[PDB]
């Protein structure tokens, strides 16, 4: 069976861990969302054929530039993530994550993933961003970024509502 290594990268604030826990566990969220997501492998059915999808979190390594690349070799597909309600995390796609990923993995497909979709129309979230003269990232802006970095897909999702969540990992598989 085909084994796929999928590595999730992005700023601390984007909820890489939540997203992976939500995708792999039942009755998410529950009482408490863990800090730790162990390396995970499960058979997933995509377009008829089963695939062994391996999932690798990178949470905690965001400030340690020489440790991060130890995760990258033999990666089949990258999820470069940003939070749709954090413009800073969006800019770091261009400034930090895409350059680094491409340096170590020149030909590996990238999917650009906008997380926290559920908060983009959240009134308190919008208000707090407005206090800083900020606004959430729009779908067109996300498309523009995906084009810029040569992502094979741009996808938006929410770990909490799980809207768009399944599609992210289906397309990750399809990209390989």
């Amino acid at each position: 069976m085909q084994a796929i290594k999928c590595v999730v990268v992005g700023d601390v604030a984007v909820g890489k861990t939540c997203l992976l826990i939500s995708y792999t566990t039942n009755a998410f969220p529950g009482e408490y969302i863990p800090t730790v997501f162990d390396n995970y492998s499960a058979n997933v059915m995509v377009d008829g054929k089963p695939v062994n999808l391996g999932l690798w979190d990178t949470a905690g390594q965001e400030d340690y530039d020489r440790l991060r690349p130890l995760s990258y070799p033999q990666t089949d597909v990258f999820l470069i993530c940003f939070s749709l309600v954090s413009p800073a995390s969006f800019e770091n796609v261009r400034a930090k994550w895409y350059p680094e990923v491409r340096h170590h993995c020149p030909n590996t497909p990238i999917i650009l993933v906008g997380t926290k979709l559920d908060l983009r129309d959240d009134k308190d979230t919008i208000e707090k961003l407005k206090e800083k003269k900020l606004t959430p990232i729009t779908y067109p802006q996300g498309l523009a970024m995906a084009k810029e970095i040569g992502a094979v897909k741009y996808l938006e999702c929410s770990a909490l509502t799980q809207r768009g969540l399944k599609t992210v990992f289906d397309e990750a598989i399809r990209a390989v």
């Binding site: 408490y32 800090t35 949470a59 020489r66 440790l67 690349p69 070799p73 033999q74």
Partner: protein, 349 residues
């Protein structure tokens, strides 16, 4: 805030604190289990029958590179886990204190510096080892007998786990601090523990950066036969420019590989990559002069020089001519030589 609102917030904090304490303990138990698995399924198995593993193509040196000091990491975390368990006995409660345990073990985590600085070499070796049928089968056998299913994460995932784990502690402690109010007895120690474990991660990160610099020089020199003089790491810090040039020294035109470092120029003969040492010049006693296209002299042995220049070793008072393939390549070399001298003289205050 008044007692009603403050009590409400306090219940939340204590509840969430307990969740964090439980995850710290739970994931530490999981981690030690992973370390025990690597020790028993691989190292102990190899140790009990060294001949068999060597016969199958897995050498003693391979094993040292692949697993590094994972057993020393295990011994530290056996102790660490036991210390955590003691603080959280008989089961975690919100008033329990963990801060001092992290502070006590801060220095013990230095073992990670070796492991993380070695892991790139380890994972690259594993890729090559798995190209060997008998070794690939042997490692899969270890995985299986160690309790892994065919669908589980591959060996590389488990070998990466120490890197992943050490970077989780600042995340776990950040959350624990968040749920440890100023009035909580653990408050000062958890604050200090958070900074301690961040410092540990930073130390590991910087050690890797430093080792990468040294290894770049060591690995290059290792490809050079018949080395003369001090090692590159003894007097240099980085390769500035390398390239193939034609060299003339009052004799035949000879193709040579040139290497410019801070403080040193080296030139070699490429073996028919590997090299044969031919010469070196301390850049402090090196001078360079332009040669005009279409000219020739004694040092060029009467050959017409194009895209060329002269190098002068003032210590030996010896000259030779270099020729690049294009004007751009010549400019690149002379720019780099000037730049090396400028930076060296700048450091000299």
């Amino acid at each position: 805030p008044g007692p009603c609102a403050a009590a409400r917030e306090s219940e939340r904090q204590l509840r969430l604190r307990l969740c964090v304490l439980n995850e710290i303990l739970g994931t530490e138990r999981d981690y030690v289990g992973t370390l025990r698995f690597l020790q028993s399924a691989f190292l102990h198995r190899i140790r009990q029958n060294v001949a068999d593993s060597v016969e199958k193509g897995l050498t003693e040196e391979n094993v040292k590179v692949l697993f590094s000091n994972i057993e020393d990491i295990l011994e530290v975390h056996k102790d660490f886990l036991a210390a955590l368990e003691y603080c959280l006995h008989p089961e975690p409660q919100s008033q329990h204190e963990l801060g001092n345990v992290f502070l006590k073990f801060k220095d013990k985590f230095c073992v990670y510096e070796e492991y993380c600085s070695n892991h790139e070499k380890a994972l690259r070796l594993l890729v090559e080892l798995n190209k060997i049928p008998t070794v690939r089968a042997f490692l899969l056998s270890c995985m299986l007998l160690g309790g892994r299913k065919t669908t589980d994460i591959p060996l590389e995932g488990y070998l990466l786990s120490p890197i992943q784990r050490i970077c989780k502690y600042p995340l776990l402690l950040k959350e624990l601090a968040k749920r440890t109010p100023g009035k909580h007895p653990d408050h000062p120690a958890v604050q200090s523990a958070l900074q301690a474990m961040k410092t540990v991660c930073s130390n590991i990160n910087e050690t890797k950066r430093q080792m990468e610099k040294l290894e770049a020089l060591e690995q290059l020199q290792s490809h050079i036969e018949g080395w003369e003089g001090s090692n590159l790491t003894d007097i240099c810090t980085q390769l500035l420019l390398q390239g193939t040039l034609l060299k003339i020294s009052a004799g035949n035109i000879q193709e040579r590989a040139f290497f410019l470092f801070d403080n040193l120029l080296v030139y070699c003969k490429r073996k028919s990559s590997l090299y044969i040492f031919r010469g070196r010049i301390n850049t402090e006693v090196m001078e360079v002069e332009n040669v005009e296209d279409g000219t020739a002299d004694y040092h060029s042995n009467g050959y017409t020089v194009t895209n060329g220049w002269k190098i002068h070793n003032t210590a030996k008072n010896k000259w030779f001519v270099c020729m690049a393939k294009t004007a751009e390549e010549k400019q690149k070399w002379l720019d780099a030589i000037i730049r090396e001298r400028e930076q060296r003289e700048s450091l000299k205050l």
